[PDB]
């Protein structure tokens, strides 16, 4: 369930 930060997606 990816989440996005400053343009990039990633887990947790």
């Amino acid at each position: 369930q990816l989440i996005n930060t400053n343009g990039s997606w990633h887990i947790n």
Partner: antibody
Amino acid sequence: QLLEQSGPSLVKPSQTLSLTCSVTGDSITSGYWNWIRKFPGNKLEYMGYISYSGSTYYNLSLRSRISITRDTSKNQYYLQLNSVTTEDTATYYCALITTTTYAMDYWGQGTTVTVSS
Amino acid sequence: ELTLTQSPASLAVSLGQRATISCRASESVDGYGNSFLHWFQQKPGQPPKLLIYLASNLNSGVPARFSGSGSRTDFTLTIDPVEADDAATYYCQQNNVDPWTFGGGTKLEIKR
């Protein structure tokens, strides 16, 4: 599920463009809430989002003069763009990204905005 | 910085034939086993409409004539067979590398 758009269709140069997106269906405390704009022929430019948590992400070209805010009780979010010029004349779409697709899957009909005196 | 390049700018395809549109990224848009590249269709007076999400997944309510393929930097949308209703502009979009961008568009014209 409906993203309704509101706002002025005419703005004077060097002034501030304020747009509103009212969401009916699910809460904006879920997903990512974006603004995109389409230039007079016919390029698309991503503007940015406010997340479910209230964190914002902006396109670096617009970081200088853009502000995306929200109101969870009214279930709306808004776009503010300052020092506007004739190059900001476009159609302004609001759109949602869910985690079902991780893409912009729901859109609003758009707000045609002309910058003029 | 990152650029998506669509080809061609305009494509003319006959009814019932196959159409192929390409999108090329200068850097990878992959991440966590997924390619963060999506395909939209836009007609005049309307918002863009999601056709393909994550490179190769068909959005619900979109016909099976549409398909997406590719990875990393090289991606392709395919319409087979193409129908009259498919006259529009097609865009690719990536949302994993700052700054987020769209391709310049590919107009599809039906030959008749």
